[PDB]
Write a protein that binds this ligand. Structure first.
Ligand SMILES: Nc1ncnc2c1ncn2[C@@H]1O[C@H](COP(=O)(O)OP(=O)(O)O)[C@@H](O)[C@H]1O
Ligand SMILES: Nc1ncnc2c1ncn2[C@@H]1O[C@H](COP(=O)(O)OP(=O)(O)O)[C@@H](O)[C@H]1O
Ligand SMILES: Nc1ncnc2c1ncn2[C@@H]1O[C@H](COP(=O)(O)OP(=O)(O)O)[C@@H](O)[C@H]1O
Ligand SMILES: Nc1ncnc2c1ncn2[C@@H]1O[C@H](COP(=O)(O)OP(=O)(O)O)[C@@H](O)[C@H]1O
Ligand SMILES: [Mg+2]
Ligand SMILES: [Mg+2]
Ligand SMILES: [Mg+2]
Ligand SMILES: [Mg+2]
Ligand SMILES: [Zn+2]
Ligand SMILES: [Zn+2]
Lengths: 53, 273, 270, 273, 273, 52
């Protein structure tokens, strides 16, 4: 398990990879796995003017 | 087979592509921090998934310079990802909305004389519906041009406009990979800007005409994996835009089509080329 | 008597100010390259003429920190130079256009419910006026907000709006220095943005009265004041504490440079 | 009692402030969408928690214009939130690192004649350790100045510098609310920028020297709830900066002090007069 | 013969181009205000002289879309005008300074691993010595990358670096038009950045080695009119950069070479096809 | 026309729209912004992609 930085809840996200995008099951926060060795979630950086498809 | 995947963050898309790639050979996950050139890479193909369009473009070119083929190519990322270069390539081959391009505020002021009001203003390099403006009159045109002038990016000084198309509460998003149509959706919204990024709702589209037109639109480029934007109008279907770093998680869910697998299959085809 | 003048470029206004100041004592011309703090400056007053409003503000504060009074003061430069702070100060005292302020784009979207269309969007800090927008409908509102959002300058997070005032093809710029009315001009144009050879003197006694009342809301300094004529009478749109005057001086014949310097020497004498 | 709380996003601290208030009266949560002026608000005091320093400033000024007091006040947000205005207010009263301000590139180039190398360049309005530079020589000074010039936010035309202070692997963040010291922490890092936003780690600080110095720094302003950044140096404690939008979640966690509760108490205090 | 000239302002270069063009046919002066596409133009060739690099690129592409050839072409303006795309085409063909490219801040931190210090940081699309930085240590690298990070233009997120080359107080600027070496100058400065736009002083250069190297650099591209930048170093001559919208008023004044005339003669050759 | 930098009335003669000129007296670089009538202005600001 790990703490959501928006909500504060402890959640299970499963077998994640580094820089992977996850949705918090409680608050619906979109988050980035910024570390695995110490499992750390983080809110995404700001959208740049050339981000997308 | 060593298949590189180049990424900023791992969205559903990238997770699914990674899965599919693993069934064909060894996958090398390449975060942007890992990208250093000239470098010593041992790769048969790289699938380019960087969230930044310009980072995608430059990393594709760099891998090409190491003799490593890229999906999509740097040439396609640039042409398809620029609204104006793409419109120029599309204009021979498929119906598109009426458009104009001007190189100064002064020249942009004459655009209504050709297109009429309302018109749509948009930056040549954006995505996700960013900086799209519906300009209903001269006062709004001036405000829009004044703001684009003050913005730092010199690209905002390339003034691209289209006639405002009256859509029926939705537009169409289709996918063609290596010349094969893989699926399409409608994107519904109460607002005229329909991207799922803000956040249009996806429904499957089985329209055979969008399939035929999407393949034609792909053929104007003649390579790669493209997400195509099409509008319905009183004059029929119009091709608006093509996107060289496709998102598809909703499109996949709603159509049941395997966009990710098709992209990877195409990548293994170019790896053997 | 030692009078400093801070500047970005030496132009007509600065040379005029220097000349009048020369009559009262020693003049020290301070280019921005000469401004370094903390430092030792031997000055009784500083006349602030930096072209950037932000540089003007900081140089005034910095001179104040060395015990040197400044025309205009750092307090007036901020209060009068910011559109929002300024209209809050004017609102109790003189008529102003109906206005609205929001702190997010969602709030800004409700502004037309108060102000109606057309309305005017402008930045709080602006002076050049390139970012002024006449917003006629919701699509234009959204376009303006979407562009401001992507400028990622946090000062565009203050969304300030006014009703669009139907002016009679011109507006008014008056000058009040130390409480004294020194002159006014009409600025004619066929565009709703009149901002400045289409200027002439304004001798409407009513703008003189209103102009002094506007200045009295701040109670100090040298101000240029922008006034609109409308169906419901004169309205004070904004005040400007950095005061360009070269055009208004020529058009009206008023010694604007001299009046500014005179005020500065009275300030120098505490 | 009716206490307004103004916020950008609901998180731990805002939620902690919400519950401490409410013990005193009715709490009204004001998202930035709810802020429209002139407006009819029925509040005895507003606790200003907007993430943007600028939005906080204008929000405070706007509530004051409706005759509603504000914690912190617009004046304090302005003076304390701007680093140059702040150090000017501190200069007489408490030791600060040696500093210099210039109004142009040419003046800024003379700064190292006063401060020596290495020195620190930073924006007057910044937080979270962003745009800090440690400048070791002229080439770097030129680089930082070149880049500031091309950002074209007029605020970067104010060139603020400090001597580089050799701290012992950490710095200090103390909290003073209405003149009462409520707690302090150490922020540890093996990078010279020690922000917890930057990956710094917080521990309790009990040093009575910093408690004394913290209250003295607060007193230079004579109002409000402030977070106070202190450096330990070869020449003793120095007050680097003050912050009128105190983040405290780590400080409260690690100290056991009720920053939320103290903040609310002060606000009800402010509501009285 | 109708020869178009596209321009932002008419510098000495453009007035000379105009005069020479008039010897070969009718000259149509096209300010940016006169550019609106799609449009009806009666022109056999356009000489692209817009001051903005990006406006030059797009106006070339638009004239090509109208079947009007352009000097330089959109392809050359894009590739030559980008530091990274240009060194990629130069690499293996002529000697160049050691270079490295990264796609993120975290990747850029590793660039000194290859290049050592001091190194040179420069933006991929710049000119006139804009935003050039000499970086002597880690702290300077960090400062530069911190500033690039917060700049709006996504292009500043493409990180391009060279080894710092110790030049003898000058560098070399040569001109090759359609494969023909037309002349060269030294640009002297007591600053390491020698552009004439920044005070660099022109002097004629007659080294036979630069002529041959210049032609070879041009042959890497295979078309157009290029101003080439060359460095003298302890390891011989290195090609640094090529420029597709050449300025030459100081170079022509100092060498007697008629760069304008040669540029127009090449334009007349491309008009014939 | 008056030079916008020094205030002097100056002689320019045969010139084109957006041509860069130099003031005979003060030597300031100026742009011909209009010929309706001949109006001079100072150079506009350099943008981040300006040059060669
Ligand atoms: N000319 C137009 N007429 C009507 N709607 C448009 C027009 N241009 C764009 N849109 C709407 O805005 C959306 C985003 O525009 P698009 O051109 O696809 O840019 P992006 O690359 O940001 O998706 C489209 O999907 C469509 O819903
Ligand atoms: N609300 C308004 N209604 C009508 N005209 C306006 C309004 N606001 C500004 N203008 C016009 O635009 C000009 C410049 O506006 P102003 O508010 O002074 O911005 P700036 O500070 O850039 O001068 C004014 O002199 C006036 O002619
Ligand atoms: N002059 C300096 N000498 C040494 N370290 C400094 C100096 N200035 C800032 N720092 C370090 O960087 C951190 C952030 O700087 P600060 O001035 O607080 O800016 P911000 O408001 O962005 O936090 C400080 O907590 C300190 O660790
Ligand atoms: N790696 C380097 N080593 C030494 N000097 C350099 C280096 N790169 C650039 N310069 C100097 O800076 C000038 C401008 O750099 P350049 O790469 O030509 O960019 P621009 O397109 O801005 O001219 C060069 O003419 C040269 O004097
Ligand atoms: Mg798109
Ligand atoms: Mg689209
Ligand atoms: Mg160049
Ligand atoms: Mg060069
Ligand atoms: Zn959560
Ligand atoms: Zn002159």
């Amino acid at each position: 398990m790990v703490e959501c930085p928006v909500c504060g809840s402890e959640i299970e996200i499963g077998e994640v990879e580094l820089h992977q995008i996850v949705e918090c099951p409680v608050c619906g926060a979109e988050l980035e796995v910024v570390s695995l060795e110490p499992l750390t979630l983080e809110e995404l950086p700001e959208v740049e003017e050339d981000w997308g498809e | 087979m060593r298949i590189g995947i180049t990424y900023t963050v791992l969205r559903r898309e990238e997770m699914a592509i990674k899965e599919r790639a693993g069934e064909f050979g060894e996958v090398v996950m390449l975060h942007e921090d890992d990208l250093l050139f000239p470098g010593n890479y041992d790769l048969d193909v790289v699938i380019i998934r960087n969230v930044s369009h310009f980072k995608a473009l430059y990393t594709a070119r760099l891998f090409e310079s190491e003799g490593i083929p890229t999906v999509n190519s740097s040439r396609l990322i640039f042409e398809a990802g620029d609204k104006l270069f793409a419109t120029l390539r599309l204009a021979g081959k498929v119906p598109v909305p009426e458009w104009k391009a001007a190189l100064s505020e002064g020249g942009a002021l004459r655009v209504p004389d050709s297109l009429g009001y309302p018109l749509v203003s948009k930056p040549v390099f954006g995505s996700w519906g960013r900086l799209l403006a519906k300009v209903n009159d001269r006062d709004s045109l001036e405000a829009v041009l004044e703001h684009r002038k003050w913005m730092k990016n010199p690209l905002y000084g390339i003034h691209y406009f289209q006639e405002f198309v009256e859509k029926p509460g939705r537009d169409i998003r289709s996918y063609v990979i290596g010349g094969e149509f893989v699926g399409a959706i409608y994107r519904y919204s109460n607002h005229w800007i329909t991207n799922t990024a803000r956040g249009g709702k996806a429904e499957p589209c089985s329209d055979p005409e969008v399939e035929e037109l999407s393949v034609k639109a792909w053929e104007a480029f003649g390579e790669g994996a493209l997400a195509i934007d099409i509008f319905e109008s009183e004059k029929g279907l119009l091709v608006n835009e093509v996107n060289p770093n496709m998102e598809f998680k909703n499109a996949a869910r709603v159509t049941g089509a395997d966009m990710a697998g098709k992209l990877v299959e195409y990548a293994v085809e170019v790896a053997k080329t």
